[PDB]
Write a protein that binds this DNA or RNA. Structure first.
Length: 102
RNA sequence: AGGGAU
């Protein structure tokens, strides 16, 4: 937009939730109205040398319509655990996909 | 390590 508030600048979103670990098939199942830019070729995650995920991840998408639809469930659940989503701009995604740590 | 405010 250019006449209202914002929270990002790209067709990318952040992800958080699920057990200490997950897979690209669970995250794409949760954004069941969107596209992951290429699927298992647009997923991302964050972790440390200690041997576990940091608790967060990202999901690239195909268009502005997918990022909007991903935010429509920003705190929903799969049915036995809950999930989180937030808007992004991909610069932050790159900033931690290559600099994550304890 | 844990449900944070993303």
């Amino acid at each position: 937009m250019m006449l209202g508030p914002e929270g990002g600048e790209g067709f990318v979103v952040k992800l958080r939730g699920l057990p200490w670990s997950c897979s690209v098939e669970d995250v794409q199942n949760f954004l069941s109205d969107c596209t992951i830019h290429d699927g298992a070729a647009g997923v991302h995650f964050i972790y440390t040398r200690e041997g576990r995920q940091s608790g967060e991840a990202f999901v690239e998408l195909g268009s502005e319509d997918d990022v909007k639809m991903a935010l429509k469930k920003d705190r929903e659940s799969m049915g036995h655990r809950y999930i989180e989503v937030f808007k992004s701009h991909r610069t932050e995604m790159d900033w931690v996909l290559k600099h994550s740590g304890p």
